[PDB]
Amino acid sequence: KVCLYLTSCVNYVPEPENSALLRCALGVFRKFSRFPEALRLALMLNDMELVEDIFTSCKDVVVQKQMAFMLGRHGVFLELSEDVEEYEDLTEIMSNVQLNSNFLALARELDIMEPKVPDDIYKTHLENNDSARMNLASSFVNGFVNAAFGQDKLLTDDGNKWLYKNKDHGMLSAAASLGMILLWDVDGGLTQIDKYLYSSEDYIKSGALLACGIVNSGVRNECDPALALLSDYVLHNSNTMRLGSIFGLGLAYAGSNREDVLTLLLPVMGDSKSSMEVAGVTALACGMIAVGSCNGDVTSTILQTIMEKSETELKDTYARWLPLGLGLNHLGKGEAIEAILAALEVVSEPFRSFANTLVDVCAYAGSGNVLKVQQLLHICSEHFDSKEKEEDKDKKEKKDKDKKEAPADMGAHQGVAVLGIALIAMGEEIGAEMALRTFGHLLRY
Amino acid sequence: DRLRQTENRATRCKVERLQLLLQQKRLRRKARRDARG
């Protein structure tokens, strides 16, 4: 059922079964125990050290595969003490450090090391024949296609003459593509980004700070090079520089719930110099760092930042990132969020329905919905039909997929049918009818 | 222009120190693997 009364606790029934009924290696136990919101500290971290002596069989595998919230992998043995047999190898596995060197080993064995240019991917020779915009597209495409390979054919050879073919914010995103070209190469990628950290342009320097964040995304390095470089820019006088440093920290320290990174970021939302873009990117970065952790200082500072803002600032497009940072901090958490729905209820109409639907959607993601969805459905077709303001239920469709992402694939079996004979069959002008993102979000293959 | 020169000099000495620490950790990691094989 939808309510977290059997959905999130019926998972405890199989837990003993692994633990002591079938084989005791607990290799599948970690998988099963991740399901209950990946509580971990009181559910897994307390119940996988016991096996230990199956370090060659289960421990060698289950530890290395683990790629979720990461402190716990580095919370045992690792820097904790490493008394745990093979601590130093278990920490090198849980930290994903080997992505770069291990990923580049696979990339040599598959004979795919050679960098590809955007034109090879476009196949402009098979195309039967605003430069600022074009360059920007080819910068992102070069980044995505050569991601984590440590080598390209665009920014390596003549990258200064590539950056200055973009304009303004496009130079920030072109410089950031160097980070994402070397995604997970923390040790080599910093040396390629360094050349841009001393730029005479705030856009290029901010994009290089964002590149340092991107390179560390999903990899816990013992030297903390993301925190150690981005810290000094979080409260910077310049906005363009703030954005690159703050989003760089949010990408470098995602899932770590690092008090020393959060205490550096939380004051930026209250700074008089922060634009609504900087405040939104700060709440977003805090919500990525503290994802699913229910962090109280992130929750309170974001709720306060929403309550202190005028209805004229809450109408800026970037204000949508405040309840996103809030919803990410409570991702998976179904019970914990009624207090946050309650606190958000005080906000006026333009932001409250959007904020409440976004936080509720993030809490109870995955779980089959049959009754709350009815309300979601009843909060999906019957607001704008009889009122002047034609924006009240649009995002409700957006999150319709949320809570029905891959629920044993029969929700998707109907979700498209639910959306099939729906708004597109009879919807509205642009508000609800813009369910296009929903179909995309439904599946990723 | 002076503030940005002091800032870029502070950033530099931070990056040059981080690159040395990353290289030292990478060499320690490698030395453990190469001794196991």
CSV table of C-alpha atoms in Angstrom, one decimal:
chain,number,residue,atom,x,y,z
A,1,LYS,CA,0.0,0.0,0.0
A,2,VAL,CA,1.0,3.6,-0.6
A,3,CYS,CA,1.2,4.6,3.0
A,4,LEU,CA,4.6,3.7,4.5
A,5,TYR,CA,3.0,1.1,6.8
A,6,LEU,CA,3.8,-2.1,4.8
A,7,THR,CA,5.6,-0.6,1.8
A,8,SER,CA,8.8,0.3,3.6
A,9,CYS,CA,8.6,-2.2,6.4
A,10,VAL,CA,7.7,-5.4,4.6
A,11,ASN,CA,11.3,-5.2,3.4
A,12,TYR,CA,12.4,-6.1,6.9
A,13,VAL,CA,10.7,-9.5,6.5
A,14,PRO,CA,13.3,-10.8,4.0
A,15,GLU,CA,16.2,-9.3,6.0
A,16,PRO,CA,16.6,-12.1,8.6
A,17,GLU,CA,16.3,-14.7,5.8
A,18,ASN,CA,19.6,-13.6,4.3
A,19,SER,CA,21.1,-12.8,7.8
A,20,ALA,CA,20.4,-16.3,9.2
A,21,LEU,CA,18.1,-18.5,7.1
A,22,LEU,CA,19.8,-19.1,3.7
A,23,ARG,CA,23.5,-18.6,3.2
A,24,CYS,CA,25.0,-16.2,5.7
A,25,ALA,CA,27.5,-14.4,3.5
A,26,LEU,CA,24.9,-11.5,3.4
A,27,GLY,CA,25.9,-10.6,-0.2
A,28,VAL,CA,22.2,-10.1,-1.1
A,29,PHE,CA,21.5,-8.8,2.4
A,30,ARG,CA,23.1,-5.4,1.5
A,31,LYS,CA,20.9,-5.2,-1.6
A,32,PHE,CA,17.8,-6.0,0.4
A,33,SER,CA,18.7,-3.6,3.2
A,34,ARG,CA,19.4,-0.8,0.8
A,35,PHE,CA,15.7,-0.9,-0.1
A,36,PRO,CA,14.4,0.5,3.3
A,37,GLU,CA,15.3,4.1,2.3
A,38,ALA,CA,19.0,2.9,2.5
A,39,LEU,CA,18.9,3.8,6.2
A,40,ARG,CA,22.3,2.0,6.4
A,41,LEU,CA,23.8,3.2,9.7
A,42,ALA,CA,21.1,1.4,11.8
A,43,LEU,CA,20.2,-1.1,9.1
A,44,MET,CA,23.2,-2.1,7.0
A,45,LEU,CA,26.4,-0.6,8.4
A,46,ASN,CA,25.5,-2.4,11.7
A,47,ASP,CA,24.8,-5.6,9.8
A,48,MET,CA,27.6,-6.2,7.3
A,49,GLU,CA,30.8,-6.0,9.3
A,50,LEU,CA,29.6,-9.2,11.0
A,51,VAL,CA,30.4,-11.4,8.0
A,52,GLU,CA,33.9,-9.9,7.4
A,53,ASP,CA,35.5,-13.4,7.1
A,54,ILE,CA,33.8,-13.7,3.7
A,55,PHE,CA,36.0,-10.8,2.4
A,56,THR,CA,37.4,-12.9,-0.5
A,57,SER,CA,33.8,-14.1,-1.5
A,58,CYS,CA,31.1,-11.4,-0.6
A,59,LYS,CA,33.2,-8.4,1.0
A,60,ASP,CA,35.5,-8.2,-2.1
A,61,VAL,CA,32.4,-7.8,-4.3
A,62,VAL,CA,29.5,-6.1,-2.3
A,63,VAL,CA,31.8,-3.4,-0.9
A,64,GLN,CA,33.2,-2.4,-4.2
A,65,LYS,CA,29.9,-2.5,-6.0
A,66,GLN,CA,28.3,-0.2,-3.5
A,67,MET,CA,28.0,3.3,-5.1
A,68,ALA,CA,25.2,4.9,-3.1
A,69,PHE,CA,25.6,7.3,-0.1
A,70,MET,CA,29.3,6.9,0.4
A,71,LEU,CA,30.5,8.0,3.9
A,72,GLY,CA,29.6,4.6,5.3
A,73,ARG,CA,31.9,2.7,2.9
A,74,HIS,CA,34.6,5.2,4.1
A,75,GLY,CA,33.0,5.1,7.6
A,76,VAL,CA,34.2,1.5,8.2
A,77,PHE,CA,37.9,0.5,8.2
A,78,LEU,CA,38.9,3.4,5.8
A,79,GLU,CA,39.8,6.5,7.9
A,80,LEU,CA,37.7,5.2,10.8
A,81,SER,CA,40.7,3.1,12.0
A,82,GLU,CA,41.2,0.4,9.2
A,83,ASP,CA,41.6,-2.3,11.9
A,84,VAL,CA,39.0,-4.0,9.7
A,85,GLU,CA,40.9,-6.7,7.8
A,86,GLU,CA,42.0,-5.1,4.4
A,87,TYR,CA,40.5,-1.7,5.5
A,88,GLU,CA,42.8,0.2,3.0
A,89,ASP,CA,41.4,-1.9,0.0
A,90,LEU,CA,37.7,-1.7,1.2
A,91,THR,CA,38.1,2.1,1.4
A,92,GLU,CA,39.7,2.3,-2.1
A,93,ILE,CA,36.6,0.3,-3.4
A,94,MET,CA,33.8,2.3,-1.6
A,95,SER,CA,35.4,5.7,-2.6
A,96,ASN,CA,35.0,4.9,-6.4
A,97,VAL,CA,38.7,6.1,-6.9
A,98,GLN,CA,39.3,3.2,-9.3
A,99,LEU,CA,36.7,4.5,-11.8
A,100,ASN,CA,39.4,6.6,-13.5
A,101,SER,CA,42.2,4.0,-13.5
A,102,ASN,CA,39.9,1.0,-13.7
A,103,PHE,CA,37.5,2.7,-16.2
A,104,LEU,CA,40.5,3.6,-18.4
A,105,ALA,CA,41.6,-0.1,-18.2
A,106,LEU,CA,38.2,-1.3,-19.7
A,107,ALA,CA,38.5,1.6,-22.2
A,108,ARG,CA,41.9,0.2,-23.4
A,109,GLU,CA,40.6,-3.4,-23.6
A,110,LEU,CA,37.6,-2.3,-25.7
A,111,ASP,CA,40.0,-0.3,-28.0
A,112,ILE,CA,37.9,3.0,-27.5
A,113,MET,CA,40.7,5.3,-26.1
A,114,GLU,CA,40.7,7.5,-29.3
A,115,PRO,CA,38.8,10.8,-28.7
A,116,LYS,CA,35.7,11.5,-30.9
A,117,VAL,CA,34.8,15.0,-32.2
A,118,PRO,CA,31.2,16.2,-32.2
A,119,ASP,CA,31.1,16.1,-36.1
A,120,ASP,CA,31.8,12.2,-36.0
A,121,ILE,CA,28.6,12.0,-33.7
A,122,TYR,CA,26.5,14.4,-35.8
A,123,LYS,CA,27.8,12.6,-39.0
A,124,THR,CA,27.6,15.9,-40.9
A,125,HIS,CA,28.8,14.0,-44.1
A,126,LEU,CA,25.5,12.0,-44.0
A,127,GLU,CA,23.5,15.2,-43.4
A,128,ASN,CA,22.6,15.7,-47.0
A,129,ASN,CA,24.0,19.2,-47.5
A,130,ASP,CA,23.9,31.7,-33.9
A,131,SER,CA,27.6,30.4,-33.8
A,132,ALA,CA,27.5,31.2,-30.0
A,133,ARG,CA,24.7,28.6,-29.6
A,134,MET,CA,26.4,26.0,-32.0
A,135,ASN,CA,29.9,26.2,-30.2
A,136,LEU,CA,28.1,25.7,-26.8
A,137,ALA,CA,26.3,22.6,-28.2
A,138,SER,CA,29.6,21.1,-29.5
A,139,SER,CA,31.3,21.9,-26.1
A,140,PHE,CA,28.6,19.9,-24.2
A,141,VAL,CA,28.7,17.1,-26.8
A,142,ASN,CA,32.5,16.9,-26.6
A,143,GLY,CA,32.2,16.7,-22.8
A,144,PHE,CA,29.5,14.0,-22.8
A,145,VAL,CA,31.2,11.9,-25.6
A,146,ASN,CA,34.7,12.0,-24.1
A,147,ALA,CA,33.5,11.9,-20.4
A,148,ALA,CA,36.2,10.4,-18.0
A,149,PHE,CA,38.6,9.6,-21.0
A,150,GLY,CA,41.1,12.4,-19.8
A,151,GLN,CA,41.7,13.4,-23.5
A,152,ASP,CA,39.8,15.3,-26.2
A,153,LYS,CA,40.5,17.0,-29.6
A,154,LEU,CA,38.9,20.5,-28.8
A,155,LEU,CA,40.3,21.7,-25.4
A,156,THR,CA,43.6,19.8,-25.2
A,157,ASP,CA,45.3,21.2,-28.4
A,158,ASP,CA,44.0,24.9,-28.6
A,159,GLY,CA,41.4,25.2,-25.8
A,160,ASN,CA,42.0,28.9,-25.2
A,161,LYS,CA,40.9,29.6,-28.9
A,162,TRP,CA,37.9,27.2,-28.3
A,163,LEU,CA,36.7,29.0,-25.1
A,164,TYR,CA,36.8,32.5,-26.8
A,165,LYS,CA,34.5,31.2,-29.6
A,166,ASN,CA,31.7,31.0,-27.0
A,167,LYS,CA,30.0,34.1,-25.4
A,168,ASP,CA,29.4,35.1,-21.7
A,169,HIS,CA,27.8,32.1,-19.8
A,170,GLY,CA,28.7,29.9,-22.8
A,171,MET,CA,32.4,30.3,-21.8
A,172,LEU,CA,31.6,29.2,-18.2
A,173,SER,CA,29.9,26.0,-19.6
A,174,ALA,CA,32.7,25.4,-22.2
A,175,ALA,CA,35.4,25.6,-19.4
A,176,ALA,CA,33.2,23.3,-17.2
A,177,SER,CA,33.2,20.7,-20.0
A,178,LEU,CA,36.9,20.0,-19.3
A,179,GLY,CA,35.9,18.7,-15.8
A,180,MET,CA,33.1,16.5,-17.3
A,181,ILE,CA,35.5,15.4,-20.2
A,182,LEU,CA,37.6,14.0,-17.3
A,183,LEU,CA,34.6,12.9,-15.1
A,184,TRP,CA,35.9,10.7,-12.3
A,185,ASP,CA,39.7,11.5,-13.1
A,186,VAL,CA,40.2,13.4,-9.9
A,187,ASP,CA,44.1,12.9,-10.0
A,188,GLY,CA,44.6,14.0,-13.7
A,189,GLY,CA,41.6,16.3,-14.3
A,190,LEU,CA,42.7,19.0,-11.8
A,191,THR,CA,45.9,19.6,-13.9
A,192,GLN,CA,43.9,20.1,-17.0
A,193,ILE,CA,41.4,22.6,-15.3
A,194,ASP,CA,44.2,24.5,-13.5
A,195,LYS,CA,45.0,26.6,-16.7
A,196,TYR,CA,41.4,28.2,-16.4
A,197,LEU,CA,41.4,29.0,-12.6
A,198,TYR,CA,43.6,32.0,-13.3
A,199,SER,CA,41.4,33.4,-16.1
A,200,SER,CA,40.7,37.2,-16.5
A,201,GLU,CA,37.0,36.3,-17.0
A,202,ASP,CA,34.6,35.5,-14.1
A,203,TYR,CA,32.5,33.2,-16.4
A,204,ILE,CA,35.6,31.1,-17.4
A,205,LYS,CA,36.8,31.0,-13.8
A,206,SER,CA,33.3,30.0,-12.5
A,207,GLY,CA,33.0,27.3,-15.2
A,208,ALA,CA,36.4,25.9,-14.1
A,209,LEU,CA,35.2,25.8,-10.5
A,210,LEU,CA,32.1,24.0,-11.7
A,211,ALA,CA,34.4,21.6,-13.7
A,212,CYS,CA,36.3,20.8,-10.4
A,213,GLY,CA,33.0,19.9,-8.8
A,214,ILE,CA,31.8,17.8,-11.8
A,215,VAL,CA,35.1,15.8,-11.9
A,216,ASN,CA,34.6,14.7,-8.2
A,217,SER,CA,30.9,13.7,-8.7
A,218,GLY,CA,30.5,10.2,-7.2
A,219,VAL,CA,34.2,9.8,-6.1
A,220,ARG,CA,35.3,10.4,-2.4
A,221,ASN,CA,39.0,11.4,-2.6
A,222,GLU,CA,41.1,11.5,0.7
A,223,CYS,CA,42.5,15.0,-0.4
A,224,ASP,CA,39.0,16.7,-0.7
A,225,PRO,CA,40.1,18.8,-3.8
A,226,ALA,CA,36.5,20.0,-4.5
A,227,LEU,CA,35.9,21.3,-1.0
A,228,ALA,CA,39.5,22.6,-0.8
A,229,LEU,CA,39.1,24.7,-4.0
A,230,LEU,CA,35.4,25.7,-4.0
A,231,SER,CA,35.3,26.8,-0.3
A,232,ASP,CA,37.0,30.2,-1.0
A,233,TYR,CA,34.3,31.1,-3.6
A,234,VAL,CA,31.0,30.2,-1.9
A,235,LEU,CA,30.6,33.8,-0.4
A,236,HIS,CA,32.6,35.6,-3.2
A,237,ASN,CA,31.5,39.2,-4.0
A,238,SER,CA,30.9,38.2,-7.7
A,239,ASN,CA,27.7,36.2,-8.5
A,240,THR,CA,29.1,34.4,-11.7
A,241,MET,CA,32.0,33.1,-9.5
A,242,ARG,CA,29.6,32.1,-6.6
A,243,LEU,CA,27.5,29.9,-9.0
A,244,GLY,CA,30.6,28.0,-10.3
A,245,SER,CA,32.0,27.5,-6.7
A,246,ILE,CA,28.7,26.5,-5.1
A,247,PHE,CA,27.4,24.1,-7.8
A,248,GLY,CA,31.0,22.7,-7.9
A,249,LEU,CA,30.8,22.0,-4.2
A,250,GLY,CA,27.3,20.5,-4.6
A,251,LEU,CA,28.6,18.1,-7.3
A,252,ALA,CA,31.9,17.2,-5.5
A,253,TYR,CA,30.3,16.4,-2.1
A,254,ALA,CA,26.9,15.0,-3.2
A,255,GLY,CA,25.5,12.4,-0.7
A,256,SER,CA,28.4,13.1,1.9
A,257,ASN,CA,26.3,15.2,4.3
A,258,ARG,CA,29.7,17.0,5.2
A,259,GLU,CA,28.9,19.6,8.1
A,260,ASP,CA,32.1,21.5,7.1
A,261,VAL,CA,30.8,21.9,3.5
A,262,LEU,CA,27.2,22.7,4.6
A,263,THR,CA,28.2,25.3,7.3
A,264,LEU,CA,30.2,27.1,4.5
A,265,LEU,CA,27.2,27.1,2.1
A,266,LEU,CA,24.1,27.8,4.4
A,267,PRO,CA,25.1,31.5,5.0
A,268,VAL,CA,25.1,32.3,1.2
A,269,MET,CA,21.2,32.1,1.1
A,270,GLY,CA,21.0,34.9,3.7
A,271,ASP,CA,23.6,37.1,2.0
A,272,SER,CA,22.2,40.5,0.7
A,273,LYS,CA,24.5,40.1,-2.4
A,274,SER,CA,23.1,36.7,-3.6
A,275,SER,CA,20.8,36.8,-6.6
A,276,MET,CA,17.7,34.4,-6.6
A,277,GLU,CA,19.9,32.3,-8.9
A,278,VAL,CA,22.7,32.1,-6.3
A,279,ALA,CA,20.2,31.4,-3.4
A,280,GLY,CA,18.5,28.7,-5.5
A,281,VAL,CA,21.8,27.0,-6.5
A,282,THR,CA,22.9,27.1,-2.8
A,283,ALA,CA,19.7,25.4,-1.6
A,284,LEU,CA,20.1,22.9,-4.5
A,285,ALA,CA,23.8,22.3,-3.6
A,286,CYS,CA,22.9,21.7,0.1
A,287,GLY,CA,20.1,19.4,-0.9
A,288,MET,CA,22.5,17.4,-3.1
A,289,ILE,CA,25.2,17.2,-0.3
A,290,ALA,CA,22.5,16.2,2.3
A,291,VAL,CA,20.3,14.0,0.0
A,292,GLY,CA,18.0,11.7,1.9
A,293,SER,CA,19.7,12.5,5.3
A,294,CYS,CA,16.9,14.7,6.7
A,295,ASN,CA,19.6,17.3,7.8
A,296,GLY,CA,18.0,19.9,10.2
A,297,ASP,CA,20.1,22.9,9.4
A,298,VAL,CA,19.6,22.5,5.6
A,299,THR,CA,15.8,22.0,6.3
A,300,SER,CA,15.4,25.1,8.6
A,301,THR,CA,17.7,27.5,6.5
A,302,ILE,CA,15.8,26.6,3.3
A,303,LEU,CA,12.3,26.9,4.9
A,304,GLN,CA,13.4,30.3,6.4
A,305,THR,CA,14.8,31.4,3.0
A,306,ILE,CA,11.3,30.7,1.5
A,307,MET,CA,9.5,32.5,4.4
A,308,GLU,CA,11.7,35.7,4.2
A,309,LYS,CA,11.3,36.1,0.4
A,310,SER,CA,8.7,38.4,-1.2
A,311,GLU,CA,6.0,37.0,-3.6
A,312,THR,CA,7.8,39.0,-6.3
A,313,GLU,CA,11.1,37.0,-5.7
A,314,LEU,CA,9.2,33.6,-5.4
A,315,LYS,CA,7.9,34.4,-9.0
A,316,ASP,CA,11.5,34.2,-10.3
A,317,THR,CA,12.2,30.9,-12.2
A,318,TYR,CA,15.2,30.2,-9.9
A,319,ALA,CA,13.0,30.2,-6.8
A,320,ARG,CA,11.9,26.7,-8.0
A,321,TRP,CA,15.3,25.4,-6.7
A,322,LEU,CA,14.5,26.2,-3.0
A,323,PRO,CA,11.8,23.5,-2.6
A,324,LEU,CA,14.0,21.2,-4.8
A,325,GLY,CA,16.9,21.5,-2.3
A,326,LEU,CA,14.3,20.9,0.5
A,327,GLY,CA,12.8,17.8,-1.3
A,328,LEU,CA,16.3,16.3,-2.0
A,329,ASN,CA,17.3,16.5,1.7
A,330,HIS,CA,14.2,14.3,2.4
A,331,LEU,CA,14.4,12.1,-0.7
A,332,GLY,CA,12.9,8.6,0.0
A,333,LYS,CA,11.9,9.8,3.5
A,334,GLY,CA,8.1,9.3,3.6
A,335,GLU,CA,7.2,9.8,7.4
A,336,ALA,CA,9.6,12.7,8.0
A,337,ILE,CA,8.1,15.3,5.5
A,338,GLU,CA,4.6,16.1,7.0
A,339,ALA,CA,6.4,18.8,9.2
A,340,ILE,CA,7.9,20.4,6.1
A,341,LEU,CA,4.6,20.3,4.2
A,342,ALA,CA,3.1,21.9,7.4
A,343,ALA,CA,5.8,24.7,7.4
A,344,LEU,CA,5.5,25.3,3.6
A,345,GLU,CA,1.7,25.7,4.0
A,346,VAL,CA,2.3,29.3,5.3
A,347,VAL,CA,3.7,30.4,1.8
A,348,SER,CA,1.3,32.1,-0.7
A,349,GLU,CA,-0.4,30.3,-3.7
A,350,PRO,CA,2.2,30.8,-6.6
A,351,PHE,CA,4.9,28.9,-4.6
A,352,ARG,CA,3.0,26.8,-1.9
A,353,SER,CA,1.2,24.2,-4.2
A,354,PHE,CA,4.4,23.9,-6.2
A,355,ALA,CA,6.6,23.5,-3.1
A,356,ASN,CA,4.3,21.0,-1.3
A,357,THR,CA,3.9,18.8,-4.4
A,358,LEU,CA,7.7,18.8,-5.0
A,359,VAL,CA,8.6,17.9,-1.4
A,360,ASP,CA,5.8,15.2,-1.2
A,361,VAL,CA,7.0,13.8,-4.6
A,362,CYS,CA,10.7,13.5,-3.4
A,363,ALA,CA,9.8,11.8,-0.1
A,364,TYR,CA,7.6,8.9,-1.4
A,365,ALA,CA,9.4,8.3,-4.8
A,366,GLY,CA,9.1,4.6,-6.2
A,367,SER,CA,6.1,3.5,-3.9
A,368,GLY,CA,2.9,2.6,-5.7
A,369,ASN,CA,0.2,5.2,-5.4
A,370,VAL,CA,-3.5,4.4,-5.7
A,371,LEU,CA,-5.1,6.8,-3.3
A,372,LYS,CA,-2.9,9.8,-3.0
A,373,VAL,CA,-2.5,9.7,-6.7
A,374,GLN,CA,-6.3,10.0,-6.9
A,375,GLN,CA,-5.8,13.4,-5.2
A,376,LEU,CA,-2.8,14.0,-7.4
A,377,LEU,CA,-5.2,13.2,-10.3
A,378,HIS,CA,-7.9,15.3,-8.7
A,379,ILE,CA,-5.0,17.9,-8.3
A,380,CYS,CA,-4.2,17.4,-12.0
A,381,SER,CA,-7.3,18.4,-14.0
A,382,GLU,CA,-9.6,20.7,-12.0
A,383,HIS,CA,-7.9,24.0,-11.0
A,384,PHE,CA,-7.3,26.1,-14.1
A,385,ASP,CA,-10.4,24.9,-15.9
A,386,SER,CA,-12.5,27.5,-14.0
A,387,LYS,CA,-10.1,30.3,-13.0
A,388,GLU,CA,-8.3,33.2,-14.5
A,389,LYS,CA,-4.7,32.2,-13.7
A,390,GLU,CA,-3.8,29.4,-16.1
A,391,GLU,CA,-1.1,27.9,-13.9
A,392,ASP,CA,-2.2,25.7,-10.9
A,393,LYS,CA,-1.9,22.0,-11.8
A,394,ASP,CA,0.9,22.0,-14.4
A,395,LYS,CA,3.7,20.7,-12.2
A,396,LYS,CA,1.3,18.1,-10.8
A,397,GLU,CA,1.5,16.3,-14.1
A,398,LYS,CA,5.2,16.7,-14.0
A,399,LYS,CA,5.5,14.8,-10.8
A,400,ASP,CA,2.8,12.4,-11.7
A,401,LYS,CA,5.5,9.9,-12.8
A,402,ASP,CA,7.3,10.5,-9.4
A,403,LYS,CA,6.1,7.8,-7.0
A,404,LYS,CA,5.5,5.6,-10.1
A,405,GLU,CA,9.0,5.5,-11.7
A,406,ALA,CA,9.5,1.8,-11.9
A,407,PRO,CA,7.0,0.2,-9.6
A,408,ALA,CA,7.3,-3.4,-10.9
A,409,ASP,CA,6.9,-1.9,-14.4
A,410,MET,CA,3.1,-2.2,-14.4
A,411,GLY,CA,2.6,1.4,-13.3
A,412,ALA,CA,4.5,2.4,-16.4
A,413,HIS,CA,2.4,-0.2,-18.2
A,414,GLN,CA,-0.5,2.2,-17.4
A,415,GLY,CA,1.2,5.5,-16.7
A,416,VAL,CA,1.6,6.2,-20.4
A,417,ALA,CA,-2.0,4.9,-20.9
A,418,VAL,CA,-2.9,7.2,-18.0
A,419,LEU,CA,-1.2,10.0,-19.9
A,420,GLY,CA,-2.4,8.4,-23.2
A,421,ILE,CA,-6.1,9.3,-22.9
A,422,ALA,CA,-5.2,12.5,-21.1
A,423,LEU,CA,-4.3,16.1,-21.5
A,424,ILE,CA,-2.8,15.6,-24.9
A,425,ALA,CA,-6.2,14.0,-25.8
A,426,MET,CA,-8.0,16.8,-23.9
A,427,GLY,CA,-5.7,19.1,-22.0
A,428,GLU,CA,-5.1,22.9,-22.0
A,429,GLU,CA,-2.9,25.5,-23.7
A,430,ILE,CA,0.5,25.1,-22.2
A,431,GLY,CA,0.2,24.5,-18.5
A,432,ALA,CA,-0.9,20.9,-18.1
A,433,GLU,CA,-0.4,20.0,-21.8
A,434,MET,CA,3.3,20.2,-21.1
A,435,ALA,CA,3.6,16.6,-19.9
A,436,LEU,CA,6.3,16.0,-22.5
A,437,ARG,CA,9.0,15.9,-19.8
A,438,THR,CA,6.9,13.3,-17.9
A,439,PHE,CA,7.1,10.8,-20.8
A,440,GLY,CA,10.8,11.3,-21.0
A,441,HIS,CA,11.2,10.9,-17.2
A,442,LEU,CA,9.1,7.8,-17.3
A,443,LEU,CA,11.9,5.7,-18.9
A,444,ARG,CA,15.6,6.3,-19.5
A,445,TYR,CA,16.3,3.6,-22.1
B,1,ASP,CA,43.3,43.9,-10.5
B,2,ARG,CA,45.5,43.8,-7.3
B,3,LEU,CA,42.8,41.8,-5.3
B,4,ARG,CA,42.5,39.3,-8.2
B,5,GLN,CA,46.4,39.0,-8.4
B,6,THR,CA,46.5,38.1,-4.6
B,7,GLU,CA,43.4,35.8,-5.0
B,8,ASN,CA,44.9,34.0,-8.1
B,9,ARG,CA,48.3,33.7,-6.2
B,10,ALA,CA,46.5,32.1,-3.1
B,11,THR,CA,44.5,29.8,-5.4
B,12,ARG,CA,47.8,28.8,-7.2
B,13,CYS,CA,49.6,27.8,-4.0
B,14,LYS,CA,46.5,25.8,-3.0
B,15,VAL,CA,46.3,23.9,-6.3
B,16,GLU,CA,50.2,23.3,-6.4
B,17,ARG,CA,49.8,21.8,-2.9
B,18,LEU,CA,46.7,19.7,-3.8
B,19,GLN,CA,48.4,18.3,-7.0
B,20,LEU,CA,51.5,17.2,-4.9
B,21,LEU,CA,49.2,15.5,-2.2
B,22,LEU,CA,47.1,13.7,-5.0
B,23,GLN,CA,50.3,12.5,-6.7
B,24,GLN,CA,51.7,11.2,-3.3
B,25,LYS,CA,48.4,9.4,-2.5
B,26,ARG,CA,48.2,7.9,-6.1
B,27,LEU,CA,51.8,6.6,-5.7
B,28,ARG,CA,51.0,5.0,-2.3
B,29,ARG,CA,47.8,3.4,-3.8
B,30,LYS,CA,49.8,2.0,-6.8
B,31,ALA,CA,52.6,0.7,-4.5
B,32,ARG,CA,50.1,-1.5,-2.6
B,33,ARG,CA,48.6,-3.0,-5.8
B,34,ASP,CA,52.0,-3.6,-7.5
B,35,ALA,CA,53.1,-5.4,-4.2
B,36,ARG,CA,50.0,-7.7,-4.2
B,37,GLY,CA,50.4,-8.8,-7.9
